[PDB]
Structures are given as structure tokens and as C-alpha cells.
Amino acid sequence: EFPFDDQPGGVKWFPSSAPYWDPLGFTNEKTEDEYWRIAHGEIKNGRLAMLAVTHYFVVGSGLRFPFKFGSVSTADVPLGLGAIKALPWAVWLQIAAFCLVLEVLTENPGFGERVPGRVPGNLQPDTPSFNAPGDLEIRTKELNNARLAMISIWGLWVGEIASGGVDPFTSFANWLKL
Amino acid sequence: EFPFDDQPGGVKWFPSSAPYWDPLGFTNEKTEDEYWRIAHGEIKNGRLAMLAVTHYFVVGSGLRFPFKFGSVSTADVPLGLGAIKALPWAVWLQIAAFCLVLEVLTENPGFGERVPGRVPGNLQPDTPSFNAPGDLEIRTKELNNARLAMISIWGLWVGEIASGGVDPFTSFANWLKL
Amino acid sequence: MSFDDEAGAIQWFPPSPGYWDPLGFVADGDTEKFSKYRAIEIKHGRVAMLGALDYFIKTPSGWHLPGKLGDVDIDSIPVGLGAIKAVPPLGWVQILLFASALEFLAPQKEDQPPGAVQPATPSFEQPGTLEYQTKEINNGRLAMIALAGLWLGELASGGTDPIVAFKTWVGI
Amino acid sequence: MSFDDEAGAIQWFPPSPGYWDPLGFVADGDTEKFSKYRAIEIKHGRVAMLGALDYFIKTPSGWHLPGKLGDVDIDSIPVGLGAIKAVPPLGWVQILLFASALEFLAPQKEDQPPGAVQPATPSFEQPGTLEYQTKEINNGRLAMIALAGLWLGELASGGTDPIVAFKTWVGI
Numbered sequence: 001e002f003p004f005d006d007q008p009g010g011v012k013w014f015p016s017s018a019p020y021w022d023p024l025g026f027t028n029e030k031t032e033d034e035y036w037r038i039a040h041g042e043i044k045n046g047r048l049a050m051l052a053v054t055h056y057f058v059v060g061s062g063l064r065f066p067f068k069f070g071s072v073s074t075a076d077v078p079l080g081l082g083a084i085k086a087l088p089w090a091v092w093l094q095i096a097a098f099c100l101v102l103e104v105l106t107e108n109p110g111f112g113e114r115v116p117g118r119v120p121g122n123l124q125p126d127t128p129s130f131n132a133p134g135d136l137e138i139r140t141k142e143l144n145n146a147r148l149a150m151i152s153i154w155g156l157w158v159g160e161i162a163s164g165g166v167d168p169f170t171s172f173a174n175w176l177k178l
Numbered sequence: 179e180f181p182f183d184d185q186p187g188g189v190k191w192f193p194s195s196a197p198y199w200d201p202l203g204f205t206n207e208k209t210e211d212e213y214w215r216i217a218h219g220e221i222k223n224g225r226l227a228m229l230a231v232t233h234y235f236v237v238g239s240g241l242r243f244p245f246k247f248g249s250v251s252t253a254d255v256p257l258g259l260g261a262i263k264a265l266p267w268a269v270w271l272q273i274a275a276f277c278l279v280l281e282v283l284t285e286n287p288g289f290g291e292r293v294p295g296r297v298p299g300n301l302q303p304d305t306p307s308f309n310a311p312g313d314l315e316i317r318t319k320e321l322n323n324a325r326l327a328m329i330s331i332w333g334l335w336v337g338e339i340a341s342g343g344v345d346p347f348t349s350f351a352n353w354l355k356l
Numbered sequence: 357m358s359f360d361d362e363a364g365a366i367q368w369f370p371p372s373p374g375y376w377d378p379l380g381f382v383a384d385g386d387t388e389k390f391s392k393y394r395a396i397e398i399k400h401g402r403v404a405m406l407g408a409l410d411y412f413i414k415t416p417s418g419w420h421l422p423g424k425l426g427d428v429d430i431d432s433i434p435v436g437l438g439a440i441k442a443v444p445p446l447g448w449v450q451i452l453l454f455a456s457a458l459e460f461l462a463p464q465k466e467d468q469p470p471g472a473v474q475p476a477t478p479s480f481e482q483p484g485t486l487e488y489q490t491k492e493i494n495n496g497r498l499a500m501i502a503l504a505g506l507w508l509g510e511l512a513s514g515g516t517d518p519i520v521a522f523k524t525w526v527g528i
Numbered sequence: 529m530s531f532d533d534e535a536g537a538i539q540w541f542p543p544s545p546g547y548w549d550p551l552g553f554v555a556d557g558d559t560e561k562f563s564k565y566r567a568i569e570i571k572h573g574r575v576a577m578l579g580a581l582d583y584f585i586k587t588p589s590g591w592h593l594p595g596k597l598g599d600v601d602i603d604s605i606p607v608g609l610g611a612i613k614a615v616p617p618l619g620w621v622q623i624l625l626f627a628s629a630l631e632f633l634a635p636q637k638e639d640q641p642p643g644a645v646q647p648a649t650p651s652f653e654q655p656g657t658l659e660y661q662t663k664e665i666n667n668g669r670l671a672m673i674a675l676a677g678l679w680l681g682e683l684a685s686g687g688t689d690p691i692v693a694f695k696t697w698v699g700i
């Protein structure tokens with residue numbers, strides 16, 4: 001039996017393979033709520049990674065808001081890990097506070113755990129403007145893009161350190177001889 | 179009989195005087211809706227005048243936002259009528275657009291005319307946070323402050339022209355020998 | 357003549373009619389002429405939305421595809437009507453052929469609502485909520501007006517960049 | 529012990545208790561000790577709100593009443609605890625007498641809710657909605673914390689201006 005074969009994200013490598021990938025059996029003997037929380041965490045980590053890689057893509061294309069955080073402007077904030085210390089700590093604290101506000105407004109019942117009637121990752125408050133759930137195909141698309149972003153943000157981090165601070169796109173072009 | 183003696187704003191000069199002031203009989207032979215619209219217009223004109231005189235009080239005390247409207251900063255915008263041409267016309271257009279948005283959101287049924295169940299001037303959308311109607315005393319207080327502001331904004335305008343551009347508070351101090 | 361509850365119906369004021377049609381183009385309530393007019397309006401708005409995206413992805417950013425378009429420098433292709441002759445005629449022919457093939461492959465069927473021309477698939481919602489239909493029609497009207505005013509105004513100003521002209525006009 | 533529905537009751541997390549009292553000061557549910565504690569908290573918060581308004585109407589704006597306060601220059605009176613000795617003792621005595629007269633004229637009655645000390649009049653709403661009671665208690669808690677941290681921090685820094693210290697701390 002494959003109890004979690006009705007959940008989005010299941011990758012089937014071969015026609016004779018298992019419906020979803022779990023070589024280490026992280027989902028074995030797990031109830032509905034445990035897998036629900038695991039999938040919720042996957043979706044949140046992946047959405048965070050998608051936003052991070054989108055930041056990398058936008059800033060690495062040369063685009064920057066004309067923001068001036070105290071004495072530091074956006075043109076003085078490096079693309080990559082060097083922005084951790086270059087950007088003022090107050091801006092980081094306010095971004096974390098905004099994320100906390102969103103968490104409060106979207107996890108008020110659940111606190112990261114299962115909410116009956118809601119699929120994992122369905123965190124947007126219900127509204128006719130936002131078609132929230134979607135079908136399994138769009139959910140799998142979101143999950144796969146999220147997993148790609150989680151792989152890619154760590155590839156950016158480990159790889160900016162390895163290159164010694166080389167621009168990720170410059171490094172990519174150099175490695176491909178572009 | 180004085181039909182509009184149950185409406186706020188009625189000033190009684192003497193114990194033997196009429197309940198409200200109307201020497202020219204602007205309210206004679208007027209239905210409920212006509213006086214409703216007249217009072218609505220009074221309240222709106224007065225609130226506009228109160229905001230204008232509050233602008234005069236705040237800016238004349240030296241306070242200014244660190245705003246930069248294009249090439250013009252708030253320190254280059256004079257207090258008084260000279261701000262009409264000094265401030266960029268786009269800022270004026272956006273302020274008028276904001277006022278129009280508020281009018282759309284607050285006059286959608288009435289269009290400046292009577293809405294059943296609503297007193298004149300009760301334009302704030304209903305919400306538990308905003309105790310909207312109030313009693314007759316607070317409504318009369320708002321109306322009287324509004325009338326004072328309408329008198330005072332025109333005293334500022336006609337009087338800035340007469341003085342030849344003298345600061346209203348400097349002119350007031352000079353006239354009082356302060 | 358039930359055009360008050362249709363998408364993109366604008367009531368200017370509370371006493372105004374439910375929709376806007378001062379010339380009486382659908383005053384009879386044909387319900388078939390109106391459907392044709394709404395399909396036309398939707399198509400015009402979507403084409404203009406793509407055109408506005410083209411205009412505002414290029415200026416004032418300066419972004420364009422690197423390289424050459426058939427022995428023609430892409431950086432030599434301007435923003436606006438001046439690009440009509442700068443772009444090679446073969447490229448315009450290919451773009452027109454692509455649009456014609458799109459029209460042939462995704463035509464308007466009488467059973468489907470006006471503008472619902474994308475082929476039916478679970479991924480693509482059709483025809484959408486009335487809120488989103490109204491949003492599409494309104495953004496299309498804005499893009500229609502915007503491209504008409506770009507073309508009439510690039511000729512009037514002698515070829516001034518629209519962003520530069522707007523910045524001069526509003527003083528930013 | 530129905531303190532979950534009282535004003536200013538903070539539930540940190542969905543699994544958290546309805547209110548916050550880690551030391552068990554009202555764990556028995558006296559309903560009279562809690563009323564006294566809420567009156568004390570409200571009074572402390574309102575006094576601290578007035579104190580915070582005093583602090584932040586003066587700095588960094590520099591505003592103060594022109595002239596002298598009994599042969600003492602008002603511009604010579606600092607912002608913070610250094611003003612305790614700068615202000616003449618007679619002025620402090622008058623302020624304390626005013627506050628004592630206010631307490632005598634507007635005491636806490638057992639029939640009225642805690643904090644509803646303003647004398648009854650149609651102009652002044654009492655006791656207000658629970659939303660506004662919570663807002664009052666929360667802003668009072670913030671002002672309480674703020675003045676405690678102003679006093680502890682003006683002594684620690686040797687007398688640095690709080691606005692200057694904050695600007696240095698956050699980098700603005």
C-alpha cells in the first residue's frame with residue numbers, strides 16, 4: 001500500500017516504480033496529520049526558496065529599487081551572502097517581522113499543524129479573488145518548482161563560497177564557456 | 179413652528195430667539211431631503227476647511243514631512259496660496275484623486291443626497307471601531323468647529339493677499355503687538 | 357438588453373445607466389451584436405496589453421534582445437512606430453504569420469463565451485469569474501487607450517521617448 | 529478565573545492559555561484581586577502614556593515652552609531624569625498636588641469597572657468597547673516598558689538623547 005499516493009508532488013521515475021519517492025521511508029507508519037505537517041513544511045521551505053532565487057534573478061539582472069535604508073542604498077548591498085552584513089540589521093529584523101505577521105495571519109488555528117478541510121500549503125485566507133486549492137497538477141507544478149528553488153538556493157550559497165565571491169551568473173557563464 | 183429644531187448646529191443667540199439662525203429663510207418651505215443635503219454640504223465644506231486650517235497650523239509651526247515631490251521638496255512649498263503654483267500639479271491632481279476616491283467610497287448610494295437611516299455628514303462606513311453618529315452635542319461641536327474653520331481659512335486667504343504675503347501668524351502677532 | 361450585469365459594465369454615478377453606450381450601438385439589445393462587440397473589445401484589449409508590455413519592458417530600462425535580427429542591429433531598433441521600418445520585413449511577416457496561425461488554431465466559437473478562444477484544457481480556466489472578466493476588460497481598455505496615445509504623441513512630439521515625455525510633463 | 533475574555537488578555541500562540549500570568553498572581557480566580565491589578569495596570573499605563581508623550585513631544589524636535597519656570601530657564605531643563613532636579617521643587621510640588629487632587633476628585637469606585645475613574649458624563653464614554661479597552665491597556669503597556677527603558681538606558685549611556693541613541697543603534 002502507498003497511503004500518500006493521493007497527495008501532490010509524487011514523482012514516479014519509472015512505470016514500474018513506486019508512486020512517490022521515499023527511499024529512506026520517512027513517511028512509513030505516519031498518520032494523516034504527520035504527513036500533512038511534513039508536506040506543509042515542504043511547501044513553506046520551497047516557497048521561501050522560490051522567493052530567494054527570484055531575488056537572485058531580479059538583482060542579478062541589474063534591477064534594484066531606489067531604496068535608501070539609512071546610510072546604505074540598494075546599490076551598496078551585494079548579491080549573495082555578503083548582503084547579510086552589508087544590509088542594516090534593522091531591515092533584516094523588519095523583514096523577519098513581516099514574515100512573522102504573515103505566519104500569525106495564516107497559521108492562527110494550525111500553528112503549522114493540520115487544519116481540517118485545508119490541504120498542506122493552502123495558507124492564503126479564503127477569498128473569491130484567490131482560487132486557493134487548485135487541482136493536483138498545479139499543486140505538483142508548484143511543489144516541483146519549489147524543490148528546484150530549494151536545490152538552487154543552496155547551489156548559489158555553496159558555490160558563492162567555493163568560487164570566492166564570483167557572481168553566480170558570471171560563474172555559470174564561465175563554467176559553460178559562454 | 180421650526181421644523182429643523184431637532185437637527186444639530188442650531189445656535190440660539192438669546193433665550194427669546196429662534197432655535198436656529200436663518201435670517202434669510204434659506205430653510206423655509208424645504209423638505210427633509212433638501213435640508214438634509216444642505217446640512218451634508220455644510221459638514222463637508224466645514225471638514226475640508228478644518229483640514230485646511232490644520233495644514234496651516236502644522237506647517238506654520240515649522241513642521242514638514244521630508245517629502246520630495248520630484249525636484250520640489252516640502253521646504254520649497256510656501257505656506258499659503260503660493261503653494262498652488264509652487265507644488266507640482268501632479269501632486270495636486272493626486273490629492274484631488276484621493277478626495278474623489280473617498281467621495282466614491284462614501285457617497286455611492288447618496289451621491290450627496292439623503293440616504294435613509296443616515297444623518298447628514300455621517301459618511302464614515304459603518305464599523306464597530308468608529309462610533310459614527312454620536313449625540314446632538316458632539317455633532318454641534320463638530321459643526322461649530324467646522325464653521326470656525328470655514329471662517330478662518332477665508333480669513334487666511336483674504337489677508338494673505340491684503341498683507342502682501344506676510345505670514346499669518348507673524349501678521350497676527352504684529353496686529354496684536356505681541 | 358441585459359448589459360448592466362455583463363463584465364466591464366461601467367456605471368459612472370449611482371444615477372447613471374448600468375453600462376455605457378452613448379451612441380446606442382446595442383440599444384436594441386441584440387445579444388448577438390453585443391457578443392461580437394465584446395469579442396472585438398476583448399481581442400483589441402489583449403493585443404494592446406501585449407503591446408504595452410513590449411513598450412514598458414524596453415523603456416526607460418533599455419532592455420532588448422542581444423545580437424542581430426537578420427543583419428539588423430537590435431540596439432538600432434527604436435521603441436515605438438519607428439521600429440516598424442527598422443524591423444526587417446521578413447520578421448514582421450513571420451510575426452504576422454504567427455498571429456494568423458494563432459487565430460486559425462484558436463478561433464471564436466459561438467457556443468463559447470466571447471473572448472474564450474483558448475482551447476479547452478484543465479490547466480486554463482474558462483471563462484473565469486466575472487470579477488476577472490471585468491479586470492481583463494478594464495486592463496485591456498487601459499492598454500488600448502495607452503497604445504493609441506503612444507502612437508498619437510510619438511508623431512506629435514517628433515519622436516520623444518514616452519517615459520521622457522511623461523517625466524517632463526509631470527516634472528519627475 | 530474567567531480572565532481569558534478580559535481586556536488585554538494575550539494568547540501568544542493558539543495552544544497558549546487565554547491570558548498570561550506565569551507567576552500565578554490571579555491563579556485562584558479571586559475576581560477582586562484581578563480587578564485591583566487591572567486598575568493598577570491601567571493607571572500605570574495611562575501615567576506612562578502621558579510621560580511618553582512628554583518625552584516624544586520634546587525630542588528630537590526641541591520643542592519646549594518659551595520663557596522661564598520660576599527663575600529657571602526652560603531651555604536649560606533637559607529631557608529625561610536630568611529634568612527632575614532642573615525643574616524647580618515648587619513646580620514639582622504643584623504637579624504632585626494637581627495629580628493628588630485628580631486622584632481625590634476621581635477615585636476608583638467598586639461599582640464601576642477598573643480604570644473607569646473619570647466622573648460620569650454623557651460626553652465621556654465609559655467603559656468603552658472591549659476593543660478600545662484592549663487598545664488602551666496595550667498602549668499603556670508599551671508606554672510603561674518605554675519609560676522604564678528610557679530611565680534604564682539614560683543612566684547606562686551616561687545621558688545620551690534617546691532619539692540619538694536609537695538612531696545610532698539602528699543606523700539612521
Ligand SMILES: CC(/C=C/C=C(C)/C=C/[C@@]12O[C@]1(C)C[C@@H](O)CC2(C)C)=C\C=C\C=C(C)\C=C\C=C(C)\C=C\[C@@]12O[C@]1(C)C[C@@H](O)CC2(C)C
Pocket residue numbers: 548549550551552553571572573575576578579580582583606607608609610611612671672673675676
Ligand atoms: C514596566 C512596568 C511594569 C512592568 C510589569 C511587568 C512586566 C509584569 C509582569 C508580570 O506581572 C505579570 C504581568 C504577570 C505575572 O504572573 C508575571 C510577571 C512577569 C511578574 C511599569 C512601569 C510604570 C511606569 C510609569 C507609571 C511611568 C511614569 C512616568 C512618569 C511619571 C514620568 C515622569 C517624567 O518623565 C517625565 C514625563 C519627564 C521627565 O523630564 C521627568 C520625569 C519625572 C522622569
